[PDB]
Amino acid sequence: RKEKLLVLMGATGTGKSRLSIDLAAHFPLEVINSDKMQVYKGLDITTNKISVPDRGGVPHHLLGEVDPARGELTPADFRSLAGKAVSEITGRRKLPVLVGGSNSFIHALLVDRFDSSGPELRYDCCFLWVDVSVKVLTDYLAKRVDDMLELGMFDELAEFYSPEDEDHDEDSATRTGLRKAIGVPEFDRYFEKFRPGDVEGEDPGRDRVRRGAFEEAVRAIKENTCHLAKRQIGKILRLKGAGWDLRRLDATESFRAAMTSDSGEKCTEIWEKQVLEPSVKIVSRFLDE
Numbered sequence: 001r002k003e004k005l006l007v008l009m010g011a012t013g014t015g016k017s018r019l020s021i022d023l024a025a026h027f028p029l030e031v032i033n034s035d036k037m038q039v040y041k042g043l044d045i046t047t048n049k050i051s052v053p054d055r056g057g058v059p060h061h062l063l064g065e066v067d068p069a070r071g072e073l074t075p076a077d078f079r080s081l082a083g084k085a086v087s088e089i090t091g092r093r094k095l096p097v098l099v100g101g102s103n104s105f106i107h108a109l110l111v112d113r114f115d116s117s118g119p120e121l122r123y124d125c126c127f128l129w130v131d132v133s134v135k136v137l138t139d140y141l142a143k144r145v146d147d148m149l150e151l152g153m154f155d156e157l158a159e160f161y162s163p164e165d166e167d168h169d170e171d172s173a174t175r176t177g178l179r180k181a182i183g184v185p186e187f188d189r190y191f192e193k194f195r196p197g198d199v200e201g202e203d204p205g206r207d208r209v210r211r212g213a214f215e216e217a218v219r220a221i222k223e224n225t226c227h228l229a230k231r232q233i234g235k236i237l238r239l240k241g242a243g244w245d246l247r248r249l250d251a252t253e254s255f256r257a258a259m260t261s262d263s264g265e266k267c268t269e270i271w272e273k274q275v276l277e278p279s280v281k282i283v284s285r286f287l288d289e
């Protein structure tokens with residue numbers, strides 16, 4: 001008896017959470033987060049967690065409930081926690097929907113036998129892959145960094161900052177857990193020089209370095225995001241080698257339109273037609289046979 005699982009895939013910021021919520025208006029469902037940074041409670045802004053008002057009352061799992069203090073949630077920990085949630089949701093007769101972009105979490109969860117120390121499918125999957133042209137994605141991702149700063153990302157990180165942390169001079173790649181999130185390592189470099197709340201006060205040529213350091217942290221964040229996007233896409237392209245029937249949704253014009261600070265009526269129209277209507281149809285057919 002192999003359970004049905006909808007899987008929403010795509011690089012960071014391609015509108016996966018959005019889509020999961022729009023589909024809920026058509027199908028009774030519940031969401032399981034598959035983004036490995038979003039599993040931790042904390043840095044709600046920095047990690048781009050979908051706001052609660054925007055979840056539309058949809059039930060979410062594996063979203064902001066792991067205590068970062070307890071270390072990394074390994075891919076094996078995830079398989080266990082999420083397989084439980086898949087099982088529970090189906091129990092309540094709603095469709096479980098895996099939403100996120102950590103291909104390492106998606107894979108650990110979905111395979112038949114997990115290769116614990118790695119470094120077919122356990123479920124009956126439907127894969128929706130939301131794709132955006134790199135350039136549009138890139139540009140949207142830079143804009144989104146600006147919206148995170150405008151929302152207060154910097155103050156969030158200044159409050160998260162702690163001199164008892166021993167990884168300030170280290171990249172996300174080898175950091176552990178929530179401290180790997182894009183934005184944390186970048187601003188640690190800035191706070192290195194300008195500790196939270198520290199001011200110049202009177203006559204320091206220091207201003208030119210403060211501005212240069214801030215600016216540099218911001219470009220680095222946009223850049224790392226852009227690079228992460230590239231590695232995710234290539235990675236997705238490789239599962240589209242291992243077979244995997246990915247149903248591609250082209251969100252490009254939705255995003256282009258979303259770039260305008262007129263990101264509402266126009267962006268919604270396009271998305272409704274180009275991304276949502278097609279997904280409803282695919283899921284609809286997946287729920288039948």
Ligand SMILES: Nc1ncnc2c1ncn2[C@@H]1O[C@H](COP(=O)(O)OP(=O)(O)OP(=O)(O)O)[C@@H](O)[C@H]1O
Pocket residue numbers: 012035036037038046047048101102103104105172173180181182183228232
């Ligand atoms: N929501 C997020 N906010 C901030 N940074 C993120 C977020 N999601 C991913 N990242 C960054 O990208 C890295 C890889 O996350 P990814 O979603 O691609 O899963 P992954 O497949 O396990 O990647 P990898 O195993 O190569 O580290 C994370 O370690 C983190 O630094």
